[PDB]
Write a protein that binds this ligand. Structure first.
Ligand SMILES: [Cl-]
Ligand SMILES: [Cl-]
Ligand SMILES: [Cl-]
Ligand SMILES: [Cl-]
Ligand SMILES: [Cl-]
Ligand SMILES: [Cl-]
Ligand SMILES: [Cl-]
Ligand SMILES: [Cl-]
Lengths: 219, 219, 219, 219, 219, 219, 219, 219
């Protein structure tokens, strides 16, 4: 278990993280944590590690790119004084290039994405105990679909930033890919991005595996 | 322009045809026709052929397969006494195979599809001036995406039936394919099925081209 | 096709342009473009010219006169840095004189209308690639109905401004008049201003004809 | 004042009479009478003849033609046992001819109108103290506007019937015509049918004048 | 007719005047004038004096005392530049003394009422063509009911202010008292203040009588 | 305390008893008992006699006269098998005579009232441990106000019946009269019928006093 | 009766006091006092002491701790110039320690609670006629349940502050404990904090007993 | 993993099982399964065993006792033809004894509980591959709290039945007990019954452990 007792864990990201969380505070009840992977992570940690004693905050905002995260970083992350910061961002950075290809101001291309995400992680690292970087993902099994291909490229950036900064790393793409050996995307997400309960469990399980969660603790 | 004044044109199909149309009647004003390709067709006919005087009915129902159409045909088509019947069905027949792959009873496989659709055309043809068969479609440019590949099989059945029965024929998939040379599917439909205004205009224009609509009339 | 690839097209006007568009931004989805002629124009351009690569913004506001357009021009037009600006204004300038004849402060008489519209076009022209001026209209076939008569006078001003400034010009009155040879007004608009889908197609088709749209492209 | 205390006065017609009245009963409070000329009549009678004690019922139904009135007459008029019946019908009978000119089955032409309305008066007259026939109207000052011209034909039938049957008679069109010497139709009704408070007051006053109301009573 | 052509008439008061009028503007449609005596006055003036050419504004606010009127006078009356100002205030000034007798800060006793109302009329008179002062009222026939008695005292103040300033005067109490010879209060207002349509007609008729309205004009 | 544990106490009457109670059952939780004197009685019994275990049902229905009670007695009282029945009726029987003075059929005059109420008590008495008759009331201190004067007549009938039948008896009018030595009616009820929390507490306390409630129990 | 005629009584606290009171004012009608113990106190005082002449304000806010009370004290208490101030606070101060044990910033531990409450009472006492301090409570009969135990400790602080400052004192815990000899908590409050009508009567009765209320006054 | 592909797993019980599931069918999508332990189980099975293809039905109904289950068994269980049936019942059977202690008819005592539950298992066992009996629970760590003590009796009956009938068995109370070594009940459920996401995860994990779920599969 990487997270220690008494620590504040803060999750930030886009709609995948948001899932109807309470605005602005994003804390104070599960209602406040929204209805997806964040709530499931916290629930399972409480079910299996109730003594862990963690405080949890959800600052996900629907629609965000890393550019949006940067504009609110000071208030929504630094000022919350978390011990651990989990980030999952890139889906919209990429998706806008494909769904609104001619509105270029909505796009966050790979150069802006890497520089901005790198910079948020470098600035934040000295202020906290740890960072978890979760790749964006696209629920699509064909590596040569253009959006999947670009999303994998964004994920490489996240992975390389995690390496360089000694952050924990969750490859969310790899978690979906495993299930995508059996299921066509639409069985998890009609839109290849916003999934069912099952997709949120895929995410929660990937996160928990990386922080050293055990389903049944051996001690 | 194949349709003549005083004639009734009835559209039937799934959500793509439905688009929020009024239930049960689906007739009498634009709002009753819903907010997609059906309404656009009717508005373009009225804009360009105001003297035609066509009665238009929308019997689309969201979620339907051809198995659902056969079950309501007597009341929703035969009893309306149309002069022209437009059919667009097959999306769900296929989609269920991929989004609920273990609920087999909800699947309509190609052999049932073909014979059922054939039955509907053969039943209706003696009572009407004509039939327009629109293929289903999937907004996906990769011919090897499993659902796109299945959809094309169903589309080929539709075309066989239209040739055999002397029905009018609209290849909706080929109309999308052309636009998909440029746009990634998400720019038309996040879910690859339900599209923007643009996609409804793709459909409307394909239908109008097949019935002999002229954008500026010659005479 | 007058509009070039990669360009930003901005539509401004009154409720006819607005049609429930998203406030304040008016961009980012068709939902955001509202449900009338603007959305139809953009849909048909995407259906038939998908490679055109255009970005579209709707800044229509219900109720506006040209006086209202002037008060928000800087923020809603100049600052959006469009390449092309389409304007359709005058309906309310005129209608208030007839529906609220004793509230004179709501009226924008011909002198204010010409000076203000001329001035917005002159100021805007050097900042953009092109301007489309669409006449206001009144869905009324009798040239001697007082409001139709005044509305034609407002349209002459728009036409003369378009000439003098080398702007494209859409005579929306002429488009309705053609259909008004067959249909009584109420069949398109009970109120002679806010029409059905069919009226919005009349408008969209008139606009597209002027920008060199082809229904079926000859190359 | 033709109406006597303890008597029941029943109004029937289309939306102009309906105005949101309570369904099915249309009786018992002001809210139940709806928000137009019927309620105004009743409020002015109560203001000026509080001792009268008149029961008032509103059986208007929006959308109705005289063909719709005949279909519900037994339940909505005969079974109410009124002493006075006020009829205002014909607007829709005409309007459909102009707003849905190709839906002929929805049209009630003048020959059917006349005989149906005549039938209703002849059926009802033996059971009541009196009948008031109000003409339909169209808020349009040009006598050659096709719908205004048709409306006047129907109005002339109403007047013939009232003379033949000794019914009370209210020329609503002539009451509007006087105001239309000054106001353009839109200042009373955008759609030329459904009017402001002012138009409902035009109607209320015309009706009251015909039944012998005095604004300040002499005795 | 005291009011002249082309003039702006502004009504101010409490809920009796307000009647759901549009906030903040209170002008631009009857919807905007609310659903009581103000709308009825304006309707009848338009029905019978359509050439009068008057602009009308409703600034009634539910709950107001004269103290509230004073706090908003500059913005809601002076700055609207009316020609004629009608005031009906005092009901709440008085009612709070009886319904919330121990919340004395809500009460506007006779000294504050006279000084404040007098002062608003004196300040306003030089800026306008005329003032109409309408007494408050209480729909209660027993002169010795304590609230009726106090309300009559407030009405004397209004009357004496009207005399001294040469303002028009409407004794609303006298109009209700006439009807209260026949009807118990509850037949017009359960609460003795907020009446039915009939009460609003009693008010409208009293106002119109004072401005020289004729039901049928003699010229 | 006249009521014993395990017993069912059923209240019936008009809106004063109803207060938004659940329909049809009017039992099972506080919300089901509505928000006035019934709920207060039950909450005070539970506060002070928690060991009693009384089932309470609220069968009030807004608008009812004693004529309405007789029409539903079998289902709403007899079929509930109560041990105690509380009746409070008469307000509407009277009120209609004053708020709809010409709708005589809606009036229940004193002779019908008396015999009907007598009938209900005589029917029910053999089946129950006891009956509590609560007088109607009118919140009006002047004994000569016509409705107050009529109400007192009905109240006197209720008291005669209770003496003749050995029923428990609550003079609600005398409880209000005492408070009306100090407060003007509007401080309790704008409409003189439906009161504040205070008025419901007046009623609750009067009822509890009659059944032998002690605020602090002696034993 | 400790409270004197003409005095302003202000209640402040958490949701138990709030009970849906009107924000921000919390005065001007019972609707405004909310639907629990405050409204019941005021109702019973008016029912039994109508001449007392008291003005009442409810400033309860759902969720508050004493830390929240301090942040709004100046505006919500001092500036209202009450004569008497009743405080009931501590439930949330304590409950957050148990329901959100790892969010320590939400907790108000005993040192902050005593210092802050003591300080508010000392600052307020010279400005008012009297203070009533009501203990917090927890509807739980087992003195050794950890939250009940802590809540009793908070109550001791309130009691000792009341002693030292000569404030009136209501032991709300003792009032519930009496009823908890008969009833399991869930019969009054599923959550052991927010009770039914009956719990609000338990509270109201405890408050009234302390201010010298008599159910039946002996003079 | 005891459950096999193509099999139907049906859950039945009270609100804890219901959680807002779709009525009547309780099948077909996640939303139809509601928002608690049932949906979590299904999402974890799909996440980790996507190839299984299990049909899942939720027949929970809020408020139910085992007496309510027997009354609807034929339609809600037998007619669904499940392969596996999960039962969790008893919370209400007990809770009513403590929250409505004098409404004895609403109580299901242990002797009726045991025989009814036994009957259901014995009826169903021949038709299914297996039965899972989940104990009821009460989130309360003190074994002497009267309701917790009663709940444990019912739980012991459930375990006896499961041993006697060879059913699968989930001790939900023991799963909560472990977490209650650390958390006070309110941190999981204010009312000690309806819990947070964490509590639903406690339940989901206990159920999954009993059916042989592996968090990371070995094979
Ligand atoms: Cl998003
Ligand atoms: Cl569909
Ligand atoms: Cl507009
Ligand atoms: Cl109509
Ligand atoms: Cl008011
Ligand atoms: Cl009632
Ligand atoms: Cl609270
Ligand atoms: Cl439940």
């Amino acid at each position: 278990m990487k997270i220690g007792s008494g620590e504040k864990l803060l999750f930030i990201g886009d709609s995948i993280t948001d899932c109807g969380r309470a605005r602005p505070e994003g804390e104070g009840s599960f209602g406040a944590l929204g209805t997806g992977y964040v709530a499931y992570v916290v629930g399972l940690l409480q079910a299996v590690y109730p003594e862990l004693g963690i405080a949890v905050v959800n600052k996900g905002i629907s629609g965000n790119t890393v550019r949006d995260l940067k504009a609110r970083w000071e208030e929504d992350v630094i000022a919350q004084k978390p011990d651990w910061v989990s980030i999952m961002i890139g889906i919209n950075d990429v998706w806008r290039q494909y769904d609104l290809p001619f509105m270029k101001e909505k796009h966050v291309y790979l150069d802006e994405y890497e520089a901005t995400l790198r910079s948020l992680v470098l600035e934040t690292k000295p202020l906290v105990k740890g960072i978890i970087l979760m790749t964006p993902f696209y629920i699509e099994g064909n590596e040569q679909d253009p959006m999947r291909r670009t999303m994998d490229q964004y994920g490489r950036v996240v992975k390389q930033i995690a390496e360089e900064t000694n952050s924990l790393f969750v490859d969310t793409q790899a978690a979906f890919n495993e299930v995508l050996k059996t299921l066509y995307p639409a069985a998890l997400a009609w839109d290849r991005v916003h999934p069912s309960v099952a997709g949120h469990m895929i995410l929660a399980r990937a996160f928990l595996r990386e922080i050293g969660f055990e389903w049944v603790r051996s001690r």
